[PDB]
Short mmCIF file of C-alpha atoms in Angstrom, two decimals:
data_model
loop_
_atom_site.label_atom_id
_atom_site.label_comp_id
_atom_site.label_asym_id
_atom_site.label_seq_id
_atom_site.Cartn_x
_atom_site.Cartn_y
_atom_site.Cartn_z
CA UNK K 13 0.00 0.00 0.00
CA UNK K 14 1.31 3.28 -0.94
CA UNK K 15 -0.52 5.15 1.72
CA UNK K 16 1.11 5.83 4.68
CA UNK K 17 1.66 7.99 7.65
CA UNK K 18 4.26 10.25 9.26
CA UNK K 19 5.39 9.77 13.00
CA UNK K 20 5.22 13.67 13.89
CA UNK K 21 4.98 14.98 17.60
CA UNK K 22 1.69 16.43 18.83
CA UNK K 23 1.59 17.44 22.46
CA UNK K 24 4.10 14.51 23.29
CA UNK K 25 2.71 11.14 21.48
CA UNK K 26 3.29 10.15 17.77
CA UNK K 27 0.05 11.10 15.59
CA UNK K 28 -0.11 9.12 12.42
CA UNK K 29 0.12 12.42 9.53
CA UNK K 30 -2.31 11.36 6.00
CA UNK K 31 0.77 11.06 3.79
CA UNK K 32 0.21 8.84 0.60
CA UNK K 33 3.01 7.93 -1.42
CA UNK K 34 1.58 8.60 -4.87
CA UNK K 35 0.80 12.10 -4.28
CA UNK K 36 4.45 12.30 -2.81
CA UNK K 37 6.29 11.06 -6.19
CA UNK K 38 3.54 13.16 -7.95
CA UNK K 39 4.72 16.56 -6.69
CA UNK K 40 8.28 15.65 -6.95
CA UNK K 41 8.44 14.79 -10.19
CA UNK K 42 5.84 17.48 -11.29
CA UNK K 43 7.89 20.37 -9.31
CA UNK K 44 11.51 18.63 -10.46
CA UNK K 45 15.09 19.49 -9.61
CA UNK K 46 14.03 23.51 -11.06
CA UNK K 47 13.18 26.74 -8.95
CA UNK K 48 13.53 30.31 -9.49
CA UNK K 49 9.86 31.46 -10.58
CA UNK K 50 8.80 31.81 -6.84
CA UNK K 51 11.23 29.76 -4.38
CA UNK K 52 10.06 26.32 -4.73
CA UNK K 53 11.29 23.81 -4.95
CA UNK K 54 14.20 24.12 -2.37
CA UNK K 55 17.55 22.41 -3.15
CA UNK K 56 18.03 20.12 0.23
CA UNK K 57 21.41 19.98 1.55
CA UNK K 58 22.79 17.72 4.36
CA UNK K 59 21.68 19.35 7.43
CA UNK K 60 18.46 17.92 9.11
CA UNK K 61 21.02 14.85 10.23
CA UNK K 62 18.43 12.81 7.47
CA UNK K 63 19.65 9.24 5.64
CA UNK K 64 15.78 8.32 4.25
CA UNK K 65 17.35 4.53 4.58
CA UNK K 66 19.20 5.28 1.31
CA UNK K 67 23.02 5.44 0.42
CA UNK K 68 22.60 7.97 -2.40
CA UNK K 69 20.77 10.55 0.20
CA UNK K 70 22.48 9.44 2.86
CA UNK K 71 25.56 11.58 1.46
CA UNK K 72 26.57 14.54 3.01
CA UNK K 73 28.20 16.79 0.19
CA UNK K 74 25.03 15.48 -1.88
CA UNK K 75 22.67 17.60 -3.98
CA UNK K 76 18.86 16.87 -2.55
CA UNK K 77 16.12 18.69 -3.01
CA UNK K 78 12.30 19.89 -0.79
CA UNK K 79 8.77 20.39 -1.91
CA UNK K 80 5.63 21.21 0.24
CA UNK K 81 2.22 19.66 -0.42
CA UNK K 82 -1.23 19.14 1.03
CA UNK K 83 -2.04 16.02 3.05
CA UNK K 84 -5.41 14.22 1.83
CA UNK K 85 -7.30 16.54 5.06
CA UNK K 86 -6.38 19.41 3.09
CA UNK K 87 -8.20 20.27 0.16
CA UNK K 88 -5.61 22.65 -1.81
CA UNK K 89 -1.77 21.87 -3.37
CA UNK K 90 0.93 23.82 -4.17
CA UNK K 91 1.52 26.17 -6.95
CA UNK K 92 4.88 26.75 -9.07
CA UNK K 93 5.09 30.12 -9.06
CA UNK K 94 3.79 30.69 -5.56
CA UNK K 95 6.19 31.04 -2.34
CA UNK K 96 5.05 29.83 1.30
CA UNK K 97 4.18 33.71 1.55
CA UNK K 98 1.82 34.22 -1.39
CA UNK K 99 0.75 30.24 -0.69
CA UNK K 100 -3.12 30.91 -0.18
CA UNK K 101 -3.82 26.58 0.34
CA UNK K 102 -2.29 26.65 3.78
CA UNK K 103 0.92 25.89 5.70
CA UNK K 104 2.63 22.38 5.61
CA UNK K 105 5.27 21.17 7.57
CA UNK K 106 5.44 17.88 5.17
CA UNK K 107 7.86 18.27 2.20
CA UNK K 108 8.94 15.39 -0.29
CA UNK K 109 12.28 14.73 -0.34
CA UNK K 110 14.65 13.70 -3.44
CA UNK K 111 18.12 13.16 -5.02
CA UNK K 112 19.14 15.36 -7.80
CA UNK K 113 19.95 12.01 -9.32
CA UNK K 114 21.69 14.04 -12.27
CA UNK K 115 19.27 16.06 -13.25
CA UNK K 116 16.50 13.13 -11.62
CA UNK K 117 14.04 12.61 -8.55
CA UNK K 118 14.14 9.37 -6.59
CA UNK K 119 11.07 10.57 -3.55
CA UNK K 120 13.65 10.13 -1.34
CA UNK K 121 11.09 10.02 0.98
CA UNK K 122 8.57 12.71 2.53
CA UNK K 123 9.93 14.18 6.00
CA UNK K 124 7.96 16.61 8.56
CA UNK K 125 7.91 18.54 11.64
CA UNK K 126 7.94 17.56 15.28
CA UNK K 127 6.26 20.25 16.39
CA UNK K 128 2.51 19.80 14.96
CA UNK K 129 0.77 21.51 17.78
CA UNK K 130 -2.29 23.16 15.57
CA UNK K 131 -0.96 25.39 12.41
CA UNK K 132 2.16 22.43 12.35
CA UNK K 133 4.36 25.01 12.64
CA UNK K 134 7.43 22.25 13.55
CA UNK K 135 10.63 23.62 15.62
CA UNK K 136 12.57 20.37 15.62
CA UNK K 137 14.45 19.07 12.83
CA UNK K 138 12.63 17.44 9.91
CA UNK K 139 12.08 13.76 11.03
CA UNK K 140 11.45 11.23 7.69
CA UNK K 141 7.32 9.92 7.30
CA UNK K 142 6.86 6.38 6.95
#
C-alpha cells in the first residue's frame, strides 16, 4: 500500500500524519530538480542529520532537493510560481524529499515537523514519514 503515515509529535505522542506515497512522487516529479519562478522547490542539503534509509541521500556533500504539499485533510496543493508567503492553500510542515539524481528525482522520501501543535508550525528538525 502506498498510503502511509508520518510519526510527527503532537503534544508529546506520535500522531499518524495522511501522507500517501503517490501524491508524494507526484509533486516531486511534477515540481523537479528547477526553482527560481517563486522559491520552490528548495535544493536540500545535508543538514536535518536525514539518511531516508538510502546510500545515495544518505551523502553529506550530496545535492537533494524539498517540496511542500497538502495532506489528503487538506483540500488545496501547491503552486509553481507561488512562495510559502503568497501560498493561499495553507501551511505544511510535510515536504517530499529527493536526489538530484543528475538532473533526476528518486522521492527520497517525505519528511515533517515535530512540532505539529495546531498550524504544524514544527521547531525540531525534519524527522522522515513512513
Amino acid at each position: 500500500a502506498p498510503i502511509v503515515t508520518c510519526r510527527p509529535k503532537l503534544d508529546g505522542r506520535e500522531k499518524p500524519f495522511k501522507v500517501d506515497v503517490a501524491t508524494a512522487q507526484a509533486q516531486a516529479r511534477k515540481a523537479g530538480l528547477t526553482t527560481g519562478k517563486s522559491g520552490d522547490p528548495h535544493r536540500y542539503f545535508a543538514g536535518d542529520h536525514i539518511r531516508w534509509g538510502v546510500n545515495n541521500c544518505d551523502k553529506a556533500d550530496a545535492i537533494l532537493w524539498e517540496y511542500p504539499i497538502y495532506w489528503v485533510g487538506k483540500n488545496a496543493e501547491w503552486a509553481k510560481d507561488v512562495k510559502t508567503s503568497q501560498q493561499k492553500g495553507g501551511p505544511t510542515p510535510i515536504r517530499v524529499v529527493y536526489a538530484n539524481s543528475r538532473g533526476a528525482v528518486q522521492y527520497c522520501g517525505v519528511m515533517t515537523h515535530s512540532k505539529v501543535d495546531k498550524n504544524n508550525q514544527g521547531k525540531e528538525f525534519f524527522e522522515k514519514c513512513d
